[PDB]
Amino acid sequence: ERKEDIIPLANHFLKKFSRKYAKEVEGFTKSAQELLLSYPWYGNVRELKNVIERAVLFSEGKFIDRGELSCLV
């Protein structure tokens, strides 16, 4: 109920971890950003924190889209 938070938060996280695991990950793609906004996030902020540490590690290029995310969300 704060879809206006998912994309900013997520982006926070993607930054934390991208720096924590030294990964050249800059950010999410549109296709991905959508998904993140549609997911119900039962865990809420917590679950997104995990979903993205996980997506940062699984990340291969500079961005994240339906690819790594769908694996979870």
């Binding site: 695991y21 917590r46 995990n50 540490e53 996980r54 590690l57 699984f58 979870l72």
Partner: protein, 173 residues
């Protein structure tokens, strides 16, 4: 020679393991009996940064529910009739290395909690009193039951789920 991974979904799961390499967040492995869970933990750890470090695997079913909260962590002297020394811990033995808790669902609510506290704080105390030990152990839970379900049954702490649910691998039969 080598080990065995060749099916797509596993051709995959191996990599997921490889990527997770440089990490330490707990990992939750789930698949039917025999699918290779405990084989993946072992591989995750062979691949983590702490491969050379110990691997403390302990079946949570291989110990009466009333003595798990006495051997996982440790024990502060004279709190239970007969104590030769405050009891060390698999957590302490696994300090610096991996702690593969097999069959998680079989954790008492009391320890499910007590683990959570150590997954976040990393500090623990043997029985009543306070923490006086420093343990750096990467949690690796594997269970063959469906965690989520157990959460609606109240047999499994949810917050402990998401905590171990950082990285989640599911081995298909």
């Amino acid at each position: 020679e080598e080990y065995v991974f060749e099916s797509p979904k596993m051709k995959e799961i191996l990599e997921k393991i490889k990527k997770i390499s440089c990490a330490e967040c707990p990992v939750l492995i789930t698949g039917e009996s025999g699918v290779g869970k405990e084989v993946v933990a072992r591989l995750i750890h062979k691949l983590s940064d702490r491969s050379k470090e110990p691997f403390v695997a302990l079946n949570v079913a291989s110990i009466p529910r009333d003595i798990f909260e006495a051997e996982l962590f440790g024990y502060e002297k004279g709190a239970f009739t007969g104590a030769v020394s405050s009891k060390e811990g698999f957590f302490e033995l696994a300090d610096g290395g991996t702690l593969f808790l097999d069959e998680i669902g079989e954790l008492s609510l009391e320890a499910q909690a007590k683990l959570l506290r150590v997954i976040e704080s990393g500090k623990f105390y043997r029985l009543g009193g306070r923490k006086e030990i420093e343990v750096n152990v990467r949690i690796l839970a594997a269970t063959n039951r469906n965690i989520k379900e157990l959460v609606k049954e109240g047999k499994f702490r949810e917050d402990l789920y998401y905590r171990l649910g950082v990285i989640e691998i599911e081995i298909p039969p």
